[PDB]
């Protein structure tokens, strides 16, 4: 049932790469035909080809020259690859299953498709000669008036980033009754600055002034930074 | 609206009376029917060559053992000779 | 080298209507799927049998000549993404893809942004750079303009200006980002970011030294 | 056979009936027959065998 990406998500044009998904919990993981899409930037959906376990080698016939891709009969690994092509097309790359149920007799012509039918947790990939400097804290520091509730405003923002990704975590998933996340631009430099201020029942607050957790991915990826007590 | 091999074909028949007709669908197999010359119009395969009538229902089409067993003043010699080529000399006979 | 719409629209609580024309649509079937934005797709319908595949409430599918007919539930509220669509050659071999039609509900409430603007304060101060935020979110849609200022008067001073992007409940939430150096945040002005889209437009102040 | 067929019988003339196909119920699939895949090499090499001499 469960299904979710692996690898870096990240490269420069030249050198080929290659992402993952593991399956697992799932009662038959042998027989389902799985593929591969992706979307671009301008949110165009695309396909790239099944495979099985059986051993069937098939991809988009626009890409066949870049991908080639391998299977683990022993645990399930599916690996992905793209050498010659590589530049414009980079997004959000995703992992899904092709489920198939069967009509009646294999090798016969009877096992039609149910389609996809689960899919994973979402990997983003883009092309971009820079490398990540990476994030460092930053908090907004709030202002509250005297009472009665009302507004309650607090953010720890990062100005500099290079993944795609980013991870949004106050006081490691603690709250989610109020969450907000939102993106920005490119600058002159390319490393975008993406900033959360997020909703809380603020009145009077005490040592339950919640962190901030960072995505990070490519660098180390582990700062916690709490938030003054200014409410 | 997508192999095919049957048809889901019609026709109208003979009743009870000759003076009334009945339309009644069916179905066939292939090449039990090949084609005349839209609506696709078919005819059964033997009506062109030969007559037809149906097999009994109640007739059972499984094969049983049937012995052939000789008259009187003859006998039936069966061969007991393992190897045996072709025809020839069988010299265990029963 | 299938063709899907991708622009209609429709009110809510009537039959809407989907469409994906192709040629390789006989050993094809056809897929849809609505991927809310950043999230994953699922299943719009599933083939459970050779013979037919509507059997749940909110969705039914019709089959034309080259056209597919997707129609859907009576009430349209509430569910409103992208619909993509795709299918398969009559080799078996490939699956084509060809866009999908993004549909929103008509009945919209009216546009009001009211987000807190934060000032730059407590970190960059402390180093070489000022990091200007006036972070609004929360609009419907975009086309809203914030007017940076120089003291009671806009300058733009080449600030950036990100894009809009549906969150929650197809609601944009861009923000807006201002760069510039901090001898200037503590030379210039005071500093207060209003936002304009029509009629009444609110706003929030930064203050400055206000600790 | 994997059909499941039914017994569609229509009077023609005073007693006779024709006894048709009817809607196939419960999908519809090929016939088949299976052969021991494994059974059957050995059968084929046993032929060969005294073929040859
Ligand atoms: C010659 O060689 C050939 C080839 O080897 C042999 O021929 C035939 O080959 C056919 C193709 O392989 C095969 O046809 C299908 O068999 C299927 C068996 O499926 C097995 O696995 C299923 C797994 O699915 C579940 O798990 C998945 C992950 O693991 C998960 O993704 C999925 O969602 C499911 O959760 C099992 O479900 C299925 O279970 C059967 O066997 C179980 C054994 O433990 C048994 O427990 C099950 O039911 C029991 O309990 C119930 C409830 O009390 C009782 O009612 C039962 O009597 C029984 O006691 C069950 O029997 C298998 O392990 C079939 O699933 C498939 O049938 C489906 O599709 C057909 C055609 O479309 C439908 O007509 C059918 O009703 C089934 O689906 C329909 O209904 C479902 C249920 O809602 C719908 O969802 C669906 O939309 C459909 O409408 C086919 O039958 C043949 O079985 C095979 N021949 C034989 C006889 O087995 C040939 O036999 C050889 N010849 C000889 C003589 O040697
Ligand atoms: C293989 O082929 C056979 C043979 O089919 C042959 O062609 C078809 C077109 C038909 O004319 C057959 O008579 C002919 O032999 C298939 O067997 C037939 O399959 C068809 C599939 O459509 C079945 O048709 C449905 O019949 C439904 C019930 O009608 C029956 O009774 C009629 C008289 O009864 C009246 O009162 C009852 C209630 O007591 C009402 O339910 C009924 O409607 C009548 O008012 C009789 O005339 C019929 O022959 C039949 O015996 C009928 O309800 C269905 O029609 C509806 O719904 C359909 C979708 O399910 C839709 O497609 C139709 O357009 C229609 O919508 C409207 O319904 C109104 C109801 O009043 C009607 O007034 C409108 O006119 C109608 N719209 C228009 C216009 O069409 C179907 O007609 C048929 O019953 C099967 N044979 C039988 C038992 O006659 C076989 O399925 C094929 N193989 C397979 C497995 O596919
Ligand atoms: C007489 O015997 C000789 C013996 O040599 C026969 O010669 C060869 O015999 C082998 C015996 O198994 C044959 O079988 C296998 O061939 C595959 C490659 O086949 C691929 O190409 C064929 C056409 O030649 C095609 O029919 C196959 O279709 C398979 O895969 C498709 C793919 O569909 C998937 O993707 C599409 C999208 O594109 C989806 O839409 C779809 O849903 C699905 O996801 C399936 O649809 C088919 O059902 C089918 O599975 C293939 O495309 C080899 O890969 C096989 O063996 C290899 O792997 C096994 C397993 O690891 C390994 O043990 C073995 O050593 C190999 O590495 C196997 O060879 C040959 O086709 C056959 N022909 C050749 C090339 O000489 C001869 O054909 C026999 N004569 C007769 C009349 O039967
Ligand atoms: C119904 O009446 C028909 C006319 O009296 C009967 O004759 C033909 O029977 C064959 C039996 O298979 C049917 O099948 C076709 O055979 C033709 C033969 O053509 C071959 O020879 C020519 C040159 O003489 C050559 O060019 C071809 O390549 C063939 O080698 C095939 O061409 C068809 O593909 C097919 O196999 C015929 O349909 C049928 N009609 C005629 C006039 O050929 C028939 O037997 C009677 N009943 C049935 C249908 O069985
Ligand atoms: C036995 O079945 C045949 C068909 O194989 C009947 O012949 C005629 O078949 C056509 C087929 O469309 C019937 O269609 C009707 O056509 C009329 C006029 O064009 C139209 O107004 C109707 O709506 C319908 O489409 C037609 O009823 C039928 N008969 C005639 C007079 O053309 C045949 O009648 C059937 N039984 C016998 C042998 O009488
Ligand atoms: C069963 O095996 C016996 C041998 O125990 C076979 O008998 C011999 O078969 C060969 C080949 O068929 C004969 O040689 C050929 O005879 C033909 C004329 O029939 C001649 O035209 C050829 O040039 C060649 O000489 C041989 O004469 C024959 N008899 C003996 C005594 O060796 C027998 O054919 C095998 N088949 C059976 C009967 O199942
Ligand atoms: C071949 O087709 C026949 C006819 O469809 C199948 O017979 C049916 O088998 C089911 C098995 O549960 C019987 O049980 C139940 O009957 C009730 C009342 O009619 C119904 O509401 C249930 O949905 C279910 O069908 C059913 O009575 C029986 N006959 C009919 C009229 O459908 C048969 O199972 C199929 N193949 C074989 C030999 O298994
Ligand atoms: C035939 O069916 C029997 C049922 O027990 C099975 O044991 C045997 O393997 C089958 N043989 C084949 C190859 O069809």
């Known amino acids: 049932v469960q299904l979710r990406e692996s690898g870096p998500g990240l490269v420069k044009p030249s050198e080929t790469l290659s992402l993952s998904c593991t399956v697992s919990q799932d009662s038959r993981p042998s027989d389902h035909s799985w593929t591969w899409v992706r979307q671009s930037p301008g949110k165009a959906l695309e396909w790239i080809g099944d495979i099985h376990y059986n051993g069937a080698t098939t991809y988009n016939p626009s890409l066949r020259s870049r991908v080639r891709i391998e299977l683990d009969q022993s645990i399930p690994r599916f690996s992905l690859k793209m050498t010659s092509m590589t530049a414009a097309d980079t997004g959000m790359y995703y992992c899904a299953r092709n489920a198939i149920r069967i009509y009646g007799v294999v090798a016969l012509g009877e096992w039609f498709h149910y389609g996809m039918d689960v899919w994973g947790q979402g990997t983003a990939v883009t092309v971009s000669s820079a490398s990540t400097k990476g994030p460092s804290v930053f908090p907004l520091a709030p202002s509250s008036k005297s009472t009665s509730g009302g507004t309650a405003a607090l953010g720890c923002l990062v100005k500099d980033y290079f993944p795609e990704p980013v991870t949004v975590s106050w006081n490691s998933g603690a709250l989610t009754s109020g969450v907000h996340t939102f993106p920005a631009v490119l600058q002159s430099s390319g490393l975008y600055s993406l900033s959360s201020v997020v909703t809380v029942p603020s009145s009077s607050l005490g040592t339950q002034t919640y962190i901030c957790n960072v995505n990070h991915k490519p660098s180390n990826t582990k700062v916690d930074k709490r938030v003054e007590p200014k409410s | 609206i997508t192999r095919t091999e049957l048809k889901n074909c019609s026709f109208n028949m003979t009743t009870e009376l000759r003076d009334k007709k009945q339309k009644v669908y069916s179905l066939f197999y292939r090449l039990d029917v090949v084609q005349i010359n839209s609506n696709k119009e078919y005819r059964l395969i033997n009506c062109n060559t030969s007559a037809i009538t149906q097999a009994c229902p109640k007739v059972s089409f499984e094969p049983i053992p049937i012995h052939y067993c000789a008259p009187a003043g003859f006998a039936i010699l069966k061969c007991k000779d393992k190897k045996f080529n072709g025809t020839g000399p069988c010299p265990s006979v029963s | 080298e299938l063709t899907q719409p991708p622009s209609v629209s429709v009110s809510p609580g009537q039959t809407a209507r989907i469409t994906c024309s192709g040629a390789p649509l006989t050993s094809r079937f056809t897929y849809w ?179 | 056979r994997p059909n499941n067929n039914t017994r569609k019988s229509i009077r023609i003339g005073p007693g006779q009936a024709f006894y048709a196909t009817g809607d196939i119920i419960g999908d519809i699939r090929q016939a088949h027959c299976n052969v021991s895949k494994a059974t059957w090499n050995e059968t084929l090499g046993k032929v060969v065998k005294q073929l040859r001499k």
């Open chain 3, 33 to 211: 799927y609505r991927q809310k934005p950043g999230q994953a797709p699922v299943l719009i319908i599933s083939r459970s049998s050779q013979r037919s595949s509507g059997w749940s409430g909110r969705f039914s599918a019709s089959w034309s000549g080259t056209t597919v007919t997707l129609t859907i539930r009576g009430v349209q509220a509430d569910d409103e993404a992208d619909y993509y669509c795709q299918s398969s050659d009559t080799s078996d071999s490939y699956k084509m893809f060809g866009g999908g039609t993004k549909l929103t509900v008509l009945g919209q409430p009216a546009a009001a942004p009211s987000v807190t603007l934060f000032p730059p304060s407590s970190e960059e101060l402390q180093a070489n750079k000022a990091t200007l935020v006036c972070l609004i979110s929360d609009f419907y849609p975009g086309a809203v303009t914030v007017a940076w200022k120089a003291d009671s008067s806009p300058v733009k001073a080449g600030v950036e200006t990100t894009t809009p992007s549906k969150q929650s409940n197809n609601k944009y939430a861009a923000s807006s980002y201002l760069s510039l150096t901090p001898e200037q945040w503590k030379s210039h002005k005071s500093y207060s970011c209003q936002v304009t889209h029509e009629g009444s437009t609110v706003e929030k102040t930064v203050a400055p030294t206000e600790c």
